[PDB]
């Protein structure tokens, strides 16, 4: 009876792989970016990357190649998952609908095989006869390619060499020839086979097995007009082909390992080279000719180019541009130039994509102490290292604050025909109208001629021809800049009130009910045009001359009343085109027409809070897309604001919301405000690029943040953050940190770049003497970060060869001080395991870092929580509970020993604890008995844990070695001396992500209980909530209904995907639900949606509600 729910909050951002080619069209250049279970598809351009398709998959993309057999119009995509789902995809655009189609698929795992060294490798013969694979030691799977083989049937051949490093097919080979580097006793060797598939074996490969260097690791296979193989070790790079052996040893590279490569020149004279360091190389192959004879190779060399992010994936594109995929930090777009700028760096960054990197640790914090949490993460490694701040929604900064319990509208207003700036704000009111002249930034209310005060203004827009307009209930008035009086005034021939207004900076359309007039602001007067009545009452109107319309406006749209409807109409004629008969007994409060970059838009709000938006045509004018929205529970009002280059639409509800732009779509993100009624852009000298926004009472003004449902702030560390605390009483973060350094000629240790810990404002170093008795080492610091400025206030450097591994911020014993405690360890490569380390207590004073108390320990402190005023701390294998003396020292109370190695610990407030390295997780009470530890229970499987958490008194979350999540509770069972000493795995789930951290927290607010967030090696931030058996079931069922309906990309089984899984167990998922999947429900067409129901009760669109009332859980 465990029931939980998991959702992605941030898709993974690390880039595990990426390929280039023509997959969209035979002419079109594509960049395929592989994340984990997300496939990004862009078209490269002059500018950069036209994003085009974003599919997710039910698998961890392990292999990714493009390729094209004969009689093929464009490239096809081969994809191999980490659970051995092969498949072959194709790009399919049915005019406007885009689709990725599965041309073939099948699962290629084998019952045998222990997975090899260097993990999976997929390769493809250039002639496209087949696909070669290495998944296991000793075997080599081959998937022969034919028009069919639509189930990718493959056979293994046997492989003498039990330990292969890398492998490619060679070029210019008659028979499909592989080439590989492998290690046996002695050293490493380079071997070749042919591959005949007829008889399925190998045969002999073109040339003798040669030797290669101890650390040869990459194999490049040079295209046709050269052929042969490039081999890359440390300090050294070599070429082989038949008798030909060319080699170089450029000290330049010795400094680091090559790690990724990429052909630039189809012919293959040039290649990029990636480095553990971030360095980028050009590898040059010097050709050479003779007449009626092809082309040898005379030499090859390396030329440093500069510095990218640390590259996994690396891909030349258009002229001198290079996509650089990074998992350790930010992926980026990069220009190589022929000349080197300042410092000799032929490399220039063009763009830069935010990668939450490895999230090594993280935590929550209400910075501006509000009610939402921000999130703060340690990220990257080495130079990419850094901190990232993450905040839900779009926020705004408030300047003035005039509380006006009424404001029923507002429009801009300049009082000078010159300046782009305005100085008045006229505002519809509680059956009145006030005005607001400004000394610029200062508030003042007066009067303007021909603008009623006791009559309630319905509009105020900026009409050209040097005049000011006020539509009131009664008249649509007119005023001037020149005359500035009763310049004109239109009164309804009958003494009947205006209902709906609509002034354009040139045109005017009012409505009297079903009555529709039309007037014009021609030089200093209001001339009239058409009259037309409608079926029912005019609900709402909008007119704005769209794209190819100077002032004068093309067609239009209008919400009506009793029939509840919206409809397409032209101008002085008033001719009905198309219309939608929406449901309900509540009318459209708001209808809007717009543009962005490449489209014209129609949107329509209802009184309930829900919207419908559809796509218009300034030419044809027909339907678009029907997909009601949620939004407020209150009538939404739509207005447009001034922003960047693609100005947007703000939605006023109780839940205020922006409508930005996606790929060519429209973002639908929260705005961080309590309630907004009406809103408009602004510019005054005193309040520029501002927006105005009123509520129940208060006018506010200010600018607007990024876009995305998430805004992300970052603090480059230049090194590798490890842990992170928040001492709030000190208004700062504490952060464990680490930089590398090298031996000197003096012996000691230099460094390799300025770091967060060397550029520190102040600084310390451990004095402590508790111990006695080229080359790389780590240097570790506690760091103190201003929570407001994100500066390295102070730095404490730790001992020579100490790792600080844990960090807490707490009060202790009776002592009223809030400390920063730090578990450490003396690490050495000759020791398989550390047996020395220390806990240290620290304080941050004025700007001071007091070393309050140390405490040597006989092991590595792996973690430590504040307990109940005491200090709990895992030491290497022991789990210990320290006390604070009034004499201000850490002294023992008790310890547990029954651990293979305690890595993680958490606390159920009371006296309950938990965790272990290669077992699964135990449960421990502390006892106000004799103050002892009692081991309540454990779980006997064997999960190399990575992360642990406690949801409640019974519920224990676990993440581990193999990207699985799992839950434990303890048995409700008679015979409580075994059935109690054991706790059962009541939830299992494959996340497909490696989790470093859990924590209670949430990103939202000011159905489901609890909320734990998690952070992954890959950039993914997910969330785990608890559920009610019923809700579980409503959703379990709905998972199954839903799977049948959705066509999964590589035709992969969702449930195969989510199946708990190790190298010795595969159970299906119990007691977990991905909203990820549930959320899919919303992307589905009503047809495919009705289906999901044939059946307390059962509806049809009832659930569409439930599913929104879920997304909003993060």
């Amino acid at each position: 009876m465990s029931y939980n729910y998991v959702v992605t909050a941030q898709k993974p951002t690390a880039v595990n792989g990426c390929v280039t080619g023509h997959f969209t069209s035979a002419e079109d250049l594509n960049l395929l970016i592989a994340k984990n279970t997300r496939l990004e598809i862009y078209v490269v351009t002059a500018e950069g990357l036209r994003p085009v398709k974003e599919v997710g998959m039910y698998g961890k993309i392990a292999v990714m190649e493009l390729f094209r057999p004969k009689g093929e119009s464009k490239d096809l995509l081969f994809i191999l998952t980490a659970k051995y789902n092969a498949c072959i995809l194709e790009y399919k655009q049915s005019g406007e609908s885009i689709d990725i189609i599965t041309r073939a698929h099948g699962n290629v795992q084998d019952r045998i095989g222990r997975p090899s060294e260097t993990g999976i490798i997929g390769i493809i013969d250039p002639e496209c006869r087949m696909i070669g694979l290495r998944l296991y030691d000793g075997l080599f799977k081959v998937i022969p390619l034919d028009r069919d083989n639509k189930e990718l049937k493959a056979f293994n051949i046997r492989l003498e060499e039990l330990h292969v490093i890398d492998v490619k097919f060679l070029y210019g080979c008659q028979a499909p020839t592989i080439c590989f580097v492998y290690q046996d006793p002695q050293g490493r060797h380079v071997k070749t086979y042919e591959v005949s598939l007829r008889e399925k074996e190998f045969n002999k490969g073109p040339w003798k097995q040669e030797n290669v260097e101890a650390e040869a690791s990459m194999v490049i296979a040079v295209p046709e007009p050269f052929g042969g193989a490039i081999i890359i070790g440390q300090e050294s790079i070599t070429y082989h082909n038949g008798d030909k052996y060319l080699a170089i040893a450029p000290p330049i590279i010795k400094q680091s390992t090559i790690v990724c490569h990429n052909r630039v020149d189809p012919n293959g004279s040039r290649y990029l080279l990636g480095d553990m360091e971030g360095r980028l190389f050009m590898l040059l192959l010097e050709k050479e000719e003779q007449m009626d004879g092809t082309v040898t190779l005379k030499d090859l060399r390396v030329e440093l180019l500069g510095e990218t992010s640390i590259a996994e994936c690396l891909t030349y594109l258009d002229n001198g541009v290079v996509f650089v995929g990074s998992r350790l930090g930010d992926s980026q777009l990069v220009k190589l130039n022929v000349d080197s700028n300042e410092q000799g760096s032929y490399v220039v960054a063009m763009e830069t994509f935010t990668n939450l990197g490895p999230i090594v640790d993280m935590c929550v914090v209400d910075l501006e102490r509000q009610g939402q949490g921000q999130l703060v993460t340690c990220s990257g490694a080495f130079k990419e290292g850094s901190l990232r701040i993450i905040r839900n929604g779009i926020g705004i900064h408030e300047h003035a604050s005039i509380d006006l319990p009424g404001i029923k509208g507002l429009w801009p207003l300049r009082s000078d025909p010159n300046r782009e700036t305005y100085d008045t704000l006229v505002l519809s009111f509680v059956g009145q109208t006030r005005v607001l002249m400004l000394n610029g930034e200062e508030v003042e209310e007066t009067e303007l001629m021909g603008f009623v005060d006791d009559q309630q203004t319905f509009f105020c827009g900026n009409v050209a021809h040097q005049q000011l307009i006020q539509i009131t209930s009664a008249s649509v008035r007119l005023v001037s800049q020149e005359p500035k009086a009763l310049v004109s005034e239109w009164k309804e021939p009958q003494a009947k009130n205006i209902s709906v207004a609509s002034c354009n900076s040139s045109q005017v359309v009012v409505a009297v009910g079903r009555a529709l007039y039309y007037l014009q602001i021609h030089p200093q007067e209001l001339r009239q045009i058409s009259h037309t009545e409608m079926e029912h009452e005019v609900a709402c109107l909008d007119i704005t001359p769209l794209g190819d319309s100077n002032g004068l406006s093309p067609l239009c749209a209008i919400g009506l009343w009793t029939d509840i409807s919206a409809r397409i109409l032209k101008l002085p004629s008033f001719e009905l085109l198309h219309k939608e008969m929406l449901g309900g007994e509540i009318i459209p409060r708001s209808i809007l027409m717009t543009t962005f970059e490449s489209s014209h838009y129609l949107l329509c709000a209802l009184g309930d809070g829900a919207l419908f938006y559809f796509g218009l045509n300034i030419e044809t004018g027909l339907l678009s897309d029907r997909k009601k929205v949620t939004l407020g529970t209150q009538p939404t009002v739509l207005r447009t604001f001034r922003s960047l280059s693609t100005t947007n639409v703000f939605a006023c509800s109780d839940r205020p919301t922006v409508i930005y732009s996606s790929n060519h779509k429209l973002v639908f993100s929260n705005v961080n405000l309590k309630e907004v009624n009406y809103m408009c852009p602004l510019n005054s000298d005193g309040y520029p690029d501002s927006l105005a926004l009123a509520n129940n009472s208060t006018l506010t003004i200010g600018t607007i943040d990024e876009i995305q449902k998430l805004h992300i702030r970052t603090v480059p560390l230049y090194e590798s953050p490890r842990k992170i605390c928040y001492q709030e009483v000190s208004q700062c973060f504490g952060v464990l940190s680490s930089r590398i350094e090298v031996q000197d000629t003096s012996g000691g240790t230099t460094a390799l770049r300025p770091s967060a810990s060397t550029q520190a404002l102040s600084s310390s170093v451990s004095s402590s003497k508790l111990f006695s008795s080229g080359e790389e080492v780590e240097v570790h610091n506690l760091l103190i970060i201003d929570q407001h400025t994100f500066e390295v206030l102070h730095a404490h450097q730790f001992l020579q060869n100490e790792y600080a591994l844990s960090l807490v911020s707490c009060k202790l014993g009776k002592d009223p001080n809030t400390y920063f405690i730090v578990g450490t360890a003396m690490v050495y490569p000759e020791e398989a395991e550390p047996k020395q380390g220390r806990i240290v207590v620290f304080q941050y004073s004025d700007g001071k870092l007091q070393t309050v108390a140390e405490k040597e320990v006989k092991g590595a402190v792996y973690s430590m929580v504040e307990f109940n005023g005491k200090l709990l701390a895992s030491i290497n294998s022991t789990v210990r509970l320290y006390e604070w003396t009034t004499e201000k020292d850490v002294r023992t109370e008790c310890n547990h020993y029954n651990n293979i190695m305690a890595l993680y610990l958490k606390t159920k407030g009371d006296f309950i604890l938990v965790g272990d390295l290669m077992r699964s997780v135990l449960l421990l009470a502390y006892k106000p008995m004799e103050g002892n530890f009692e081991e309540i229970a454990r779980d006997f499987n064997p999960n190399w844990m990575s992360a642990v958490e406690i949801l409640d008194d019974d519920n224990f979350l676990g993440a581990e070695n193999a990207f699985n999540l799992f839950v434990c509770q303890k048995d409700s069972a008679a015979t409580t001396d075994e059935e109690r000493q054991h706790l059962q795995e009541v939830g299992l789930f494959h996340l497909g992500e490696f989790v470093n951290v859990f924590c209670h927290g949430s990103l939202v607010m000011q159905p489901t209980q609890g909320s734990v967030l998690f952070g992954t090696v890959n950039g993914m931030i997910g969330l785990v909530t608890s559920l009610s058996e019923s809700w579980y079931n409503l959703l379990l069922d709905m998972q199954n209904r839903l799977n049948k309906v959705i066509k999964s990309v590589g035709k992969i089984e969702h449930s195969f995907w989510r199946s708990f899984h190790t190298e010795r167990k595969t159970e299906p998922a119990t007691g977990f639900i991905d909203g990820d999947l549930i959320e899919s429900f919303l992307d589905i067409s009503r047809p495919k949606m009705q289906e999901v129901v044939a059946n307390r009760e059962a509806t049809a669109d009832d659930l569409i509600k439930v599913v929104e009332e879920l997304t909003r859980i993060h």
């Binding site: 998992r327 050495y828 990575s946 090696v1017």
Partner: peptide, 13 residues
């Protein structure tokens, strides 16, 4: 050393 592995089994490479 449990370290060399264990502080790297974060990075993930």
């Amino acid at each position: 050393s449990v370290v060399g592995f264990l502080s790297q089994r974060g990075l993930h490479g």
